[PDB]
Design a protein around this nucleic acid. Sequence first.
DNA 1: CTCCGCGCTGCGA
DNA 2: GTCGCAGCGC
Length: 627
Amino acid sequence: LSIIDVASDQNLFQTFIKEWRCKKRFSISLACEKIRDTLVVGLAVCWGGRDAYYFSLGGLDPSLTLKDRMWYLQSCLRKESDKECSVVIYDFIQSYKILLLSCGISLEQSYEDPKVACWLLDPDSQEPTLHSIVTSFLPHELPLLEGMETSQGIQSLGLNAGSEHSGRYRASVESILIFNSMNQLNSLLQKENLQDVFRKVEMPSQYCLALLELNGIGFSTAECESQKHIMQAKLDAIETQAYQLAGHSFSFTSSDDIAEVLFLELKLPPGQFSTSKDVLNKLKALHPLPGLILEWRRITNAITKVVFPLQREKCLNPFLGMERIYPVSQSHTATGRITFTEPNIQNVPRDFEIKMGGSGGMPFSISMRHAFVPFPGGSILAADYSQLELRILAHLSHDRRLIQVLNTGADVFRSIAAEWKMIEPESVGDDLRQQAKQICYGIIYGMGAKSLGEQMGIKENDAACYIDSFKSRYTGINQFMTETVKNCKRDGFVQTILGRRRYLPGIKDNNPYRKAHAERQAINTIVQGSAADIVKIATVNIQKQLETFHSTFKSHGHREGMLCPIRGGFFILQLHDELLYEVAEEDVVQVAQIVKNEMESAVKLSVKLKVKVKIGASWGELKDFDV
DNA sequence: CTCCGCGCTGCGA
DNA sequence: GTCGCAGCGC
Ligand SMILES: CN(C(=O)Oc1c(N2CCN(CCO)C2=O)cc(C(F)(F)F)cc1C(F)(F)F)c1ccc(F)cc1
Ligand SMILES: Nc1nc2c(ncn2[C@H]2CC[C@@H](COP(=O)(O)OP(=O)(O)OP(=O)(O)O)O2)c(=O)[nH]1
Ligand SMILES: [Mg+2]
């Protein structure tokens, strides 16, 4: 195709930079090749048609020194008041990282990612690939990717150095394929009214998500190995104690040789012979072994799936003098939530105690949320949304009882256990509060009486009286739920607070399980997704105002090249109703004021949003803050 | 065929 | 190598 090598002639280069400055929209494809590791060889630009303007950064005019080329490169990729420029890149979060870390260019224009648009048009769709966006939106240029089998991988074609094709060809092909496909996706977004969401909350959230990836969460490898050795010892003692409690050895992973010990060798009560966790919690009250196996599964899940993984992905930050974990973002969820991968620092286990030693042992707290530490002379500011997924239900269902218990102040999860266990509300521990939290949310979202009785440890008909009490007590929640399945059946889609549409065609299926899944999924999506929006619209506005009062830097990777006092706040992790920031000592109070002022001013609902700000030297060592 | 929802990950088949 | 089951987390 038309591949203009702009860096070949001096007059040809300056004409490309002149035309580049008149563009209010263009495309980029970072070209990366092997060393013979990654290495940005060049770049690709497109403003229309099948013209690709390769920007070699390594056959070239000697008068165009690399340094003179990099000045013009940053002269066109930086904002200058009302430039109105909107770039289109295939992987914005990783292209913004590679450009900042391998070239020194901190992008400041507007951004448009075709992958985000493909998800915003169908959250249930498959992860977009360049072959999946061309086949669906630009099929008339599909014969271009012929031979380029790398188009079927989520890695950008220009960033896939493993392909035998040159980095120039791979980037030039992608530059025109993503520019024209974005014009088609922009035409579809403008039709469904969702174009504003793509550029006002969604794509600017991926910018904050690219910043947190360069920042990374702190990690204390010494606190991990200490918490590990306490856990392995209890694991080592649970095996020996359990193997004496049964007389013979038995693998805690073989449900066959476990049900033998419990239901047969120990004559424990029971469809039957199930070593499930819902059953072993009921049998926990009869023999020490049903509780020792549940502890074996808790420690093993930690010392294998949160400990050993975290001590693998740890990296050194020589500038900050720390060892920080570098997770990966993933916003491709059906509810709009943001999850993390490699490693998932969202699944870090909660604070749990182990009792080791003679007599009644000795209490030993194991908070694995505690090795995550701030920088020298820093803090970790966490801000909760209280009960966001229930205050939203109050704004939609308008139930006069859910709003009553919301303004009261009681912990309704504890109050559920007070009615369940017939215990004082203040006596409800966290283990029972979490079990009652699952009972609270599941019953609202359509938990059956069979699963309720199995969790509650009571009969099916006994648990059915608890469900029918909820329907009678809270009556506005079901008026909306029956009206929600009315609006999803007539339309075939559920809409969030921002207009995002999840398409549920299974609500008309002939199978009762299939209609129920979509019926249930419709009620969760309208409230789980509306919460992921309220978080996202707050996440962007907090980085916006932190960038206003900005005598600081905006990311640890940004300041890694400018080098100095680390003064500003930083992003690290986002839980589905809680935002964590790594603020610096000097302005712990200012950021906490911005994080909380914006998390409330993010949306305006019937029920005002309550936000609880906490602060400390660890994600587990958190204490309240006044703001 | 089988009835809260979303999400990731290691092991075993 | 690939996917299901089940462990934890919102
Ligand atoms: C019938 N029942 C109940 O009502 O529990 C609540 C409650 N509570 C908590 C205390 N309480 C008394 C007046 O406030 C009340 O109504 C609140 C809510 C929500 F605030 F979220 F709306 C949801 C639920 C529910 F669990 F039903 F979903 C119940 C069901 C299973 C159990 F193990 C214990 C109780
Ligand atoms: N359906 C469903 N949603 C859940 C479940 N656990 C968490 N969620 C969703 C709904 C609430 C939201 C926040 O979860 P958290 O665990 O932060 O809960 P919380 O009740 O807001 O927290 P707390 O009262 O302890 O501050 O995530 C669950 O088991 N089922
Ligand atoms: Mg919470």
